Design a protein around this ligand. Structure first.
Ligand SMILES: CCCCCCSC[C@H](NC(=O)CC[C@H]([NH3+])C(=O)O)C(=O)NCC(=O)O
Ligand SMILES: CCCCCCSC[C@H](NC(=O)CC[C@H]([NH3+])C(=O)O)C(=O)NCC(=O)O
Lengths: 218, 203
């Protein structure tokens, strides 16, 4: 299964952790966005949205959006080990719904506000300062996460990490390398250390996040 | 089941079409954001993220994010009509993955870039038009946004978003597949008339 990616990319790292959890080996295909490798006609024919991660499965089925890939990996490549799939992606509609809400929270709030705050600083114009409104908004996202984690081990509840933990762990590791002091959010920091110590593929998350630190050397 | 909403709100409209599709009646709880009703302690106790739509089911289960609500409605209520549930939310992992990708596309790209442009910047406009072009491309040779022979919850979500584009004054006929899908899907999806009317009257 071909996996078009960059290690620095949070959503790519979420997929790497999930593939590790379900015992899927990914054929890693570095996709240099700066070089426009995602804009090559062969890539566009696979994925007209020209984005990473992109997964191409054994039949040539092409999928993108990291969290859609996470669910697909569990349902198709994990579900044989029923207990494992249930831990990663509980099927009770209430439990499933909380996992989904946290995944959407990660894409549209937690990672979205990270991008809105930092991307203008580290790319394009490279604005020399962060917008204070964008900072407050981002801090509000961290505050939401901190609240979700109050009296809970994991982001969507459960006795074990779910795919929501894996997605948010990719995101939070990116906050860390950006230089955000997560110790401001005690539950987030506690969860971050614990989940980093136990999840499959945490090595890919840690090393890839360090790579993304290349945007933050100044 | 209690539905905390505003009539003009896209994600609210998406949930309303989905409830209609599964034959669920919603107890409407108008939640005025400009009036700060989402920041009242009663609401914050239900939903610390203080956002609408929020659903409270009979058993006291609280849920937010429209697209999570959509899935919940199908899984819990749609499942009483097996063929219906499979039309709205196909179970095959590949088919479901496309539905999921389209739902995430809607929140993070299509609606996101709409919000960035309308809530006029040349760069923000370009980014928004790129999202419309993506949807236009997805719809080349497909009746529905995630494929399939019938509308899925991804169609319903994107219908709510696209109705907001229309009322904001964007010329959707620039994206032929988008306009074609929008007019046709609006004609056949139960409650989709109310979607456009709600967008037009309150958006
Ligand atoms: C500013 C520093 C660099 C940040 C890199 C961000 S990750 C690369 C980016 N991918 C995404 O943002 C995918 C997000 C998507 N929501 C997911 O989870 O898969 C991309 O392919 N972008 C190219 C494109 O979409 O055209
Ligand atoms: C005239 C209607 C136009 C304005 C409607 C905007 S939708 C209201 C907004 N809700 C959301 O953006 C929820 C988005 C979420 N992605 C979903 O799909 O449910 C909100 O509760 N915002 C308040 C908050 O989050 O604090």
């Amino acid at each position: 299964m071909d996996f078009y990616y960059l290690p620095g990319s949070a959503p790519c790292r979420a997929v790497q952790m999930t593939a590790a959890a379900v015992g899927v080996e990914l054929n890693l295909k570095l996709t240099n966005l700066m070089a426009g490798e995602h804009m090559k006609p062969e890539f566009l024919k696979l994925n007209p949205q020209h984005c990473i991660p992109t997964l191409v499965d054994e039949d040539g089925f092409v999928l993108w959006e990291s969290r859609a890939i996470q669910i697909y990996l569990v349902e198709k490549y994990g579900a044989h080990d029923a207990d494992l799939a249930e831990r990663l992606y509980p099927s009770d509609p209430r439990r499933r719904a909380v996992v989904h809400q946290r995944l959407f929270f990660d894409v549209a709030v937690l990672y979205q506000r990270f991008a809105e705050y930092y991307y203008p600083q580290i790319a394009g114009q490279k604005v020399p300062v962060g917008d204070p409104g964008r900072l407050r908004s981002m801090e509000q996202a961290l505050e939401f996460l901190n609240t979700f984690l109050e009296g809970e081990q994991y982001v969507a509840g459960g006795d074990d990490p779910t795919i929501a933990d894996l997605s948010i762990l990719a995101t939070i590791a990116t906050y860390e390398v950006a230089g955000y002091d997560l110790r401001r959010y005690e539950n987030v920091q506690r969860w971050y250390e614990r989940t980093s110590a136990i999840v499959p593929g945490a090595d890919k998350n840690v090393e890839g996040a360090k790579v993304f630190g290349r945007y933050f050397t100044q």
